[PDB]
Amino acid sequence: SLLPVPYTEAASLSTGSTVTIKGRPLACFLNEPYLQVDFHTEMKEESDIVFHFQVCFGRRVVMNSREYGAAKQQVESKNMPFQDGQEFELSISVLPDKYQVMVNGQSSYTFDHRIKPEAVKMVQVWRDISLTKFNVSYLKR
Amino acid sequence: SLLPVPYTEAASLSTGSTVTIKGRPLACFLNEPYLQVDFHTEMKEESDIVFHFQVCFGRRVVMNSREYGAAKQQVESKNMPFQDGQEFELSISVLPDKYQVMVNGQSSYTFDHRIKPEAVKMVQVWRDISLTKFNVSYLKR
């Protein structure tokens, strides 16, 4: 719908930052659409990824980092707060020690920092969703 | 680019039919974009799938059917003729006993019929590609 997908925005993150995303899966859960959010160290898409978050709707969530070109230790969750056929609101907050992912207001996943959030230069949101809102907060010193 | 994605077209298939697709992945292979082609028994996206073909570019190909709502025996291939950053031409021919998948003119995958091709009513092409051509042949009795 409204925003282009794949969606790319330059971004800066530190403790207290929040990334808020509103969107809808492009297919029913039976067909297993995906959602992916990547926090990149450069504007180039092949750059390293401080935080990789990939939803297989209805099935599982996988999180990882890509450091010097190489995927690291994948963590997997079967927690699935997303609802079939529904619009979702996803917020990723940068806490001192981790990212916290809220889905529709509910804390759903966390991921300890492997690289300082200050290394992030770009956020990409892609795979099988439409996007109506993307926001990064910039109020903190 | 030119065609909408997810792309849905009503279709009829029998021995001698060919489905030809021309497109480009939306991301470099390092980021593992997907391509999926599904031959459905009805126009509804939740309908059964006579032939499910899913490319994880640079990694693997998975093929299956979905019968009465349930995924069946998955077959996996590591054959990867698709080239990083390149446009591809994919053709799926309906042979008497199987689907044959050509990639850029090269036979690359086959999949024995689990359900008669006559059950197909719809083809959907989706995931992380742009599409410039989709054609189904209709010349045979």
Side-chain angles (χ1 to χ4, degrees), chain A residues 1-43 46-58 60-88 90-140, chain B residues 1-43 46-58 60-88 90-140:
Chain A
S1 64
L2 266 158
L3 294 172
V5 176
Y7 182 87
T8 300
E9 186 172 304
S12 296
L13 302 176
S14 56
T15 304
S17 294
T18 300
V19 183
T20 303
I21 298 157
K22 174 135 72 58
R24 194 181 222 108
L26 296 178
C28 63
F29 281 18
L30 186 63
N31 290 345
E32 299 179 7
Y34 302 115
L35 158 69
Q36 190 162 320
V37 178
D38 295 314
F39 293 179
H40 278 263
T41 60
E42 307 288 343
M43 291 296 304
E46 62 278 8
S47 69
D48 285 355
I49 296 167
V50 173
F51 176 50
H52 158 78
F53 175 84
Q54 186 190 40
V55 181
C56 184
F57 287 103
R60 67 176 199 169
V61 173
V62 157
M63 294 170 289
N64 211 338
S65 58
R66 183 167 77 207
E67 309 180 23
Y68 306 93
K72 308 297 286 190
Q73 172 65 251
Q74 163 176 295
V75 309
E76 180 179 327
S77 168
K78 297 277 187 171
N79 189 27
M80 189 52 52
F82 303 93
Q83 298 296 306
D84 194 2
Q86 301 315 305
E87 175 180 65
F88 56 84
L90 188 81
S91 80
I92 307 170
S93 291
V94 184
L95 312 189
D97 282 14
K98 66 194 111 175
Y99 298 101
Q100 177 169 44
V101 184
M102 320 284 296
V103 182
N104 301 325
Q106 171 184 357
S107 177
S108 300
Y109 318 92
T110 62
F111 183 89
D112 282 7
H113 294 306
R114 302 170 176 184
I115 301 164
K116 65 184 174 186
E118 286 78 11
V120 173
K121 287 186 183 49
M122 176 269 273
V123 175
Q124 190 175 51
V125 184
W126 63 299
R127 313 263 190 206
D128 314 293
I129 66 161
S130 62
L131 217 51
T132 57
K133 183 237 289 150
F134 180 94
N135 180 264
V136 179
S137 62
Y138 286 101
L139 302 189
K140 272 58 188 304
Chain B
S1 64
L2 266 158
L3 294 172
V5 176
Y7 182 87
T8 300
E9 186 172 304
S12 296
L13 302 176
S14 56
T15 304
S17 294
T18 300
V19 183
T20 303
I21 298 157
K22 174 135 72 58
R24 194 181 222 108
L26 296 178
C28 63
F29 281 18
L30 186 63
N31 290 345
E32 299 179 7
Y34 302 115
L35 158 69
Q36 190 162 320
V37 178
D38 295 314
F39 293 179
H40 278 263
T41 60
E42 307 288 343
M43 291 296 304
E46 62 278 8
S47 69
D48 285 355
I49 296 167
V50 173
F51 176 50
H52 158 78
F53 175 84
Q54 186 190 40
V55 181
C56 184
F57 287 103
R60 67 176 199 169
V61 173
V62 157
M63 294 170 289
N64 211 338
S65 58
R66 183 167 77 207
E67 309 180 23
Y68 306 93
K72 308 297 286 190
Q73 172 65 251
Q74 163 176 295
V75 309
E76 180 179 327
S77 168
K78 297 277 187 171
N79 189 27
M80 189 52 52
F82 303 93
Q83 298 296 306
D84 194 2
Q86 301 315 305
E87 175 180 65
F88 56 84
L90 188 81
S91 80
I92 307 170
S93 291
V94 184
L95 312 189
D97 282 14
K98 66 194 111 175
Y99 298 101
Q100 177 169 44
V101 184
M102 320 284 296
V103 182
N104 301 325
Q106 171 184 357
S107 177
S108 300
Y109 318 92
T110 62
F111 183 89
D112 282 7
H113 294 306
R114 302 170 176 184
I115 301 164
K116 65 184 174 186
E118 286 78 11
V120 173
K121 287 186 183 49
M122 176 269 273
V123 175
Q124 190 175 51
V125 184
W126 63 299
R127 313 263 190 206
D128 314 293
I129 66 161
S130 62
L131 217 51
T132 57
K133 183 237 289 150
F134 180 94
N135 180 264
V136 179
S137 62
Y138 286 101
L139 302 189
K140 272 58 188 304

Short mmCIF file of all heavy atoms in Angstrom, two decimals, chain B residues 24-25 27 29 57-58 80-88 103-104 106:
data_model
loop_
_atom_site.label_atom_id
_atom_site.label_comp_id
_atom_site.label_asym_id
_atom_site.label_seq_id
_atom_site.Cartn_x
_atom_site.Cartn_y
_atom_site.Cartn_z
N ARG B 24 13.36 -10.52 -11.80
CA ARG B 24 14.63 -10.19 -11.18
C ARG B 24 14.46 -10.21 -9.67
O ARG B 24 13.44 -9.72 -9.15
CB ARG B 24 15.09 -8.79 -11.64
CG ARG B 24 16.53 -8.48 -11.34
CD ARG B 24 16.89 -7.08 -11.81
NE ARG B 24 18.21 -7.05 -12.44
CZ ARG B 24 18.41 -6.88 -13.75
NH1 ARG B 24 17.38 -6.71 -14.57
NH2 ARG B 24 19.66 -6.89 -14.23
N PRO B 25 15.43 -10.77 -8.94
CA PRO B 25 15.36 -10.72 -7.47
C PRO B 25 15.47 -9.28 -6.98
O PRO B 25 16.18 -8.46 -7.57
CB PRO B 25 16.56 -11.57 -7.02
CG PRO B 25 16.92 -12.42 -8.22
CD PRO B 25 16.61 -11.53 -9.40
N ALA B 27 16.82 -8.34 -4.16
CA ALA B 27 17.93 -8.14 -3.24
C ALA B 27 19.09 -9.00 -3.71
O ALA B 27 18.91 -9.94 -4.48
CB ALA B 27 17.54 -8.48 -1.80
N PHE B 29 22.00 -11.86 -3.38
CA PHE B 29 21.87 -13.22 -2.86
C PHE B 29 22.30 -13.31 -1.40
O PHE B 29 21.77 -14.14 -0.65
CB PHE B 29 22.68 -14.20 -3.72
CG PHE B 29 21.99 -14.60 -5.02
CD1 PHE B 29 20.95 -13.85 -5.54
CD2 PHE B 29 22.39 -15.74 -5.69
CE1 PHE B 29 20.31 -14.24 -6.73
CE2 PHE B 29 21.76 -16.14 -6.88
CZ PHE B 29 20.73 -15.38 -7.40
N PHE B 57 17.17 -17.84 -3.12
CA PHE B 57 18.24 -17.55 -4.08
C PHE B 57 19.61 -17.68 -3.42
O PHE B 57 19.85 -17.13 -2.34
CB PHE B 57 18.09 -16.14 -4.67
CG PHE B 57 16.95 -15.99 -5.67
CD1 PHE B 57 15.77 -15.36 -5.29
CD2 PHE B 57 17.08 -16.46 -6.97
CE1 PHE B 57 14.73 -15.20 -6.20
CE2 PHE B 57 16.03 -16.32 -7.88
CZ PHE B 57 14.85 -15.70 -7.50
N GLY B 58 20.50 -18.41 -4.08
CA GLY B 58 21.82 -18.65 -3.56
C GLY B 58 21.93 -19.82 -2.61
O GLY B 58 23.06 -20.21 -2.26
N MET B 80 21.49 -24.57 -8.19
CA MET B 80 21.28 -23.12 -8.13
C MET B 80 21.79 -22.45 -9.40
O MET B 80 22.81 -21.76 -9.39
CB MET B 80 21.95 -22.53 -6.88
CG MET B 80 21.62 -21.06 -6.58
SD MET B 80 19.85 -20.63 -6.52
CE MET B 80 19.20 -21.84 -5.37
N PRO B 81 21.06 -22.61 -10.51
CA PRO B 81 21.48 -21.93 -11.76
C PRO B 81 21.23 -20.43 -11.77
O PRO B 81 21.83 -19.74 -12.60
CB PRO B 81 20.62 -22.63 -12.83
CG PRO B 81 19.39 -23.08 -12.08
CD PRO B 81 19.89 -23.48 -10.71
N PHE B 82 20.37 -19.90 -10.90
CA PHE B 82 20.15 -18.46 -10.86
C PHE B 82 21.44 -17.72 -10.50
O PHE B 82 22.21 -18.18 -9.66
CB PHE B 82 19.07 -18.11 -9.83
CG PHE B 82 17.76 -18.80 -10.08
CD1 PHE B 82 17.47 -20.01 -9.47
CD2 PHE B 82 16.80 -18.23 -10.90
CE1 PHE B 82 16.25 -20.65 -9.69
CE2 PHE B 82 15.58 -18.85 -11.13
CZ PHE B 82 15.30 -20.07 -10.51
N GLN B 83 21.64 -16.56 -11.12
CA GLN B 83 22.86 -15.78 -10.95
C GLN B 83 22.61 -14.51 -10.14
O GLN B 83 21.62 -13.80 -10.37
CB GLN B 83 23.45 -15.42 -12.32
CG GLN B 83 23.84 -16.67 -13.12
CD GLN B 83 24.95 -17.44 -12.45
OE1 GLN B 83 26.01 -16.88 -12.13
NE2 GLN B 83 24.72 -18.74 -12.18
N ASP B 84 23.52 -14.22 -9.21
CA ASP B 84 23.38 -13.08 -8.30
C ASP B 84 23.22 -11.78 -9.09
O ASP B 84 23.99 -11.49 -10.01
CB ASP B 84 24.61 -13.01 -7.39
CG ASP B 84 24.41 -12.08 -6.19
OD1 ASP B 84 23.33 -11.49 -6.00
OD2 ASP B 84 25.37 -11.95 -5.40
N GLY B 85 22.19 -11.02 -8.74
CA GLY B 85 21.96 -9.72 -9.34
C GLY B 85 21.42 -9.74 -10.75
O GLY B 85 21.28 -8.66 -11.35
N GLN B 86 21.09 -10.90 -11.31
CA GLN B 86 20.71 -11.02 -12.71
C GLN B 86 19.22 -11.24 -12.88
O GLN B 86 18.54 -11.82 -12.02
CB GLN B 86 21.46 -12.17 -13.40
CG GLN B 86 22.98 -12.04 -13.36
CD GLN B 86 23.45 -10.65 -13.72
OE1 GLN B 86 23.10 -10.12 -14.78
NE2 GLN B 86 24.23 -10.03 -12.82
N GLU B 87 18.71 -10.78 -14.01
CA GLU B 87 17.38 -11.16 -14.46
C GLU B 87 17.39 -12.64 -14.84
O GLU B 87 18.39 -13.16 -15.35
CB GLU B 87 16.98 -10.30 -15.64
CG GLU B 87 15.68 -10.67 -16.29
CD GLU B 87 15.37 -9.74 -17.44
OE1 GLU B 87 16.13 -9.76 -18.43
OE2 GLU B 87 14.40 -8.97 -17.33
N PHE B 88 16.28 -13.33 -14.57
CA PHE B 88 16.17 -14.74 -14.91
C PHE B 88 14.96 -14.97 -15.81
O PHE B 88 14.01 -14.18 -15.83
CB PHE B 88 16.04 -15.61 -13.65
CG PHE B 88 14.90 -15.22 -12.76
CD1 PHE B 88 13.62 -15.67 -13.01
CD2 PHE B 88 15.12 -14.39 -11.67
CE1 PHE B 88 12.57 -15.31 -12.20
CE2 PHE B 88 14.07 -14.02 -10.84
CZ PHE B 88 12.79 -14.48 -11.10
N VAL B 103 15.70 -23.03 -16.21
CA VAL B 103 16.20 -21.72 -15.76
C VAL B 103 17.21 -21.24 -16.79
O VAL B 103 18.23 -21.90 -17.03
CB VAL B 103 16.83 -21.80 -14.37
CG1 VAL B 103 17.31 -20.40 -13.91
CG2 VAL B 103 15.85 -22.42 -13.37
N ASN B 104 16.93 -20.09 -17.40
CA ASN B 104 17.80 -19.52 -18.43
C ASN B 104 18.17 -20.58 -19.48
O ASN B 104 19.33 -20.72 -19.88
CB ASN B 104 19.04 -18.89 -17.81
CG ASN B 104 18.69 -17.79 -16.82
OD1 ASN B 104 17.72 -17.06 -17.03
ND2 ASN B 104 19.45 -17.68 -15.74
N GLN B 106 18.21 -23.83 -19.21
CA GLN B 106 18.84 -25.04 -18.71
C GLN B 106 17.87 -25.81 -17.83
O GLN B 106 17.30 -25.24 -16.89
CB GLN B 106 20.11 -24.67 -17.92
CG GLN B 106 20.75 -25.79 -17.17
CD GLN B 106 21.94 -25.31 -16.35
OE1 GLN B 106 22.31 -24.13 -16.41
NE2 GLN B 106 22.55 -26.22 -15.59
#
